[PDB]
Amino acid sequence: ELSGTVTFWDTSNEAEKATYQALAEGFEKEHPKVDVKYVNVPFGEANAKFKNAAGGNSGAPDVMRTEVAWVADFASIGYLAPLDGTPALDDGSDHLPQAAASTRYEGKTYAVPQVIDTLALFYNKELLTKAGVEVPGSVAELKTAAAEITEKTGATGLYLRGDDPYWFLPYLYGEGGDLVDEKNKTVTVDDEAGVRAYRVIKDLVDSKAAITDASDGWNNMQNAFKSGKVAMMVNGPWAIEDVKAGARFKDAGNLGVAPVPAGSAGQGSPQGGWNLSVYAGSKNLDASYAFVKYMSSAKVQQQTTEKLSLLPTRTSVYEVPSVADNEMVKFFKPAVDKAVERPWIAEGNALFEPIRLQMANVLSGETSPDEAAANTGDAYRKLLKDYK
Numbered sequence: 001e002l003s004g005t006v007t008f009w010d011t012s013n014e015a016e017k018a019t020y021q022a023l024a025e026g027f028e029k030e031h032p033k034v035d036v037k038y039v040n041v042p043f044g045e046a047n048a049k050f051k052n053a054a055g056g057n058s059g060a061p062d063v064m065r066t067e068v069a070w071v072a073d074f075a076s077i078g079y080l081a082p083l084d085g086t087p088a089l090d091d092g093s094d095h096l097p098q099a100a101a102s103t104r105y106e107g108k109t110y111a112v113p114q115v116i117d118t119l120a121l122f123y124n125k126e127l128l129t130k131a132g133v134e135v136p137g138s139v140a141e142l143k144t145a146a147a148e149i150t151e152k153t154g155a156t157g158l159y160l161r162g163d164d165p166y167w168f169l170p171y172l173y174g175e176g177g178d179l180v181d182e183k184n185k186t187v188t189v190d191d192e193a194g195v196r197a198y199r200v201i202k203d204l205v206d207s208k209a210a211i212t213d214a215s216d217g218w219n220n221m222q223n224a225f226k227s228g229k230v231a232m233m234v235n236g237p238w239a240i241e242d243v244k245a246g247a248r249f250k251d252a253g254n255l256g257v258a259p260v261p262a263g264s265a266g267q268g269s270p271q272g273g274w275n276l277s278v279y280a281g282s283k284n285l286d287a288s289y290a291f292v293k294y295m296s297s298a299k300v301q302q303q304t305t306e307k308l309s310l311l312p313t314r315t316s317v318y319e320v321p322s323v324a325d326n327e328m329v330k331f332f333k334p335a336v337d338k339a340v341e342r343p344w345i346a347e348g349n350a351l352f353e354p355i356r357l358q359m360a361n362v363l364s365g366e367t368s369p370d371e372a373a374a375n376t377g378d379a380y381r382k383l384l385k386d387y388k
């Protein structure tokens with residue numbers, strides 16, 4: 001017996017949201033006495049919007065699309081219903097383990113996995129071919145390629161997103177670095193790899209291998225890539241359908257994807273994604289648990305992939321020929337398998353702001369790579385009282 005309102009806050013983007021609204025409302029097919037109230041909440045506003053509503057117990061959603069780092073955020077302050085022993089969890093073991101870790105806080109389950117993702121190098125196949133260059137495997141190989149692209153086509157090699165701190169991580173990993181050593185509770189972002197990573201990004205822009213912008217970075221990146229102003233960008237699966245809307249990439253075939261470039265030490269890309277959580281103060285808990293089970297079901301994950309090319313969290317879904325034979329998926333799944341995990345801690349979400357500020361100042365020339373790394377480390381030690 002399910003009935004009543006289930007308000008769902010979805011953070012998915014302009015290209016994704018019609019699909020997600022349809023899936024959400026599809027819950028009513030099997031439960032016609034439930035009224036699904038779909039609301040799209042912009043990614044940048046959603047964390048604060050949810051905390052505001054939950055903290056005041058006023059107009060909070062029943063079900064929240066919850067970024068991997070937000071689960072511990074929200075859970076630690078009491079805003080999420082624990083899900084262990086509820087109908088929200090069905091065939092839990094099916095989910096990728098690294099997806100499952102992000103749902104956990106202090107020995108309890110506060111979310112169900114929805115999608116998993118990572119960053120990759122997207123490229124314009126026809127531009128690279130016209131430039132006579134191969135997809136670059138390293139930063140060194142990207143610089144050489146960018147020069148040939150400018151010389152032969154007039155395009156810039158890379159749009160380097162300059163306003164979102166997540167985009168720093170591939171460069172950090174490529175220089176042999178990482179934010180923290182979790183096992184040893186030690187801040188590591190200010191090791192020499194951090195200095196090198198800030199220096200690499202500045203060199204890419206100064207050398208004109210890359211362009212960037214200090215604001216409106218998502219739109220600027222997409223516009224530059226779709227208009228052929230650049231040959232390459234670093235982005236994730238949430239960009240695929242948006243890109244394919246463009247005249248340049250209808251022929252889905254013209255859209256190349258490859259790993260993010262190696263740096264001087266190695267190569268890596270971060271693990272991200274989205275889970276589904278239930279507000280602790282929901283006045284329709286049964287219907288919400290069922291809604292979460294439905295939205296995380298193999299059937300719905302498969303449909304999401306078919307319409308959007310977003311990656312399922314369920315292992316079984318990869319065995320469905322329709323998913324197993326998808327080319328964006330065929331690339332992204334192995335890349336996700338290799339993606340770097342982060343500490344799933346209450347202050348994990350706040351590790352990004354320090355990077356954002358220092359990265360902006362490095363790109364504008366206000367701050368040296370050396371100072372930026374030290375500043376980032378200083379901010380982490382302030383955030384993480386039991387880290388050295």
Ligand SMILES: C[C@H]1O[C@H](O[C@H]2[C@H](O)[C@@H](O)[C@@H](O[C@H]3[C@H](O)[C@@H](O)[C@@H](O[C@H]4[C@H](O)[C@@H](O)[C@@H](O)O[C@@H]4CO)O[C@@H]3CO)O[C@@H]2CO)[C@H](O)[C@H](O)[C@@H]1N[C@H]1CC(CO)[C@H](O)[C@@H](O)[C@@H]1O
Pocket residue numbers: 011012013016043044045047067068069070117164165166218236238271272273274349350352353
């Ligand atoms: C600073 C923020 O730090 C963190 O976020 C990390 C995040 O943990 C990383 O994993 C990564 O997330 C990936 C994501 O995994 C990936 O899927 C994709 O998301 C797509 C969707 O796919 C697409 O469907 C649609 O939704 O659109 C999504 C976006 O395209 O890309 C994400 C990266 O963009 O990177 C984030 C850092 O960016 C915090 O969580 C904060 O919320 C914080 N926000 C601040 C906002 C404030 C402003 O006043 C205010 O000052 C600050 O205090 C606020 O806190």
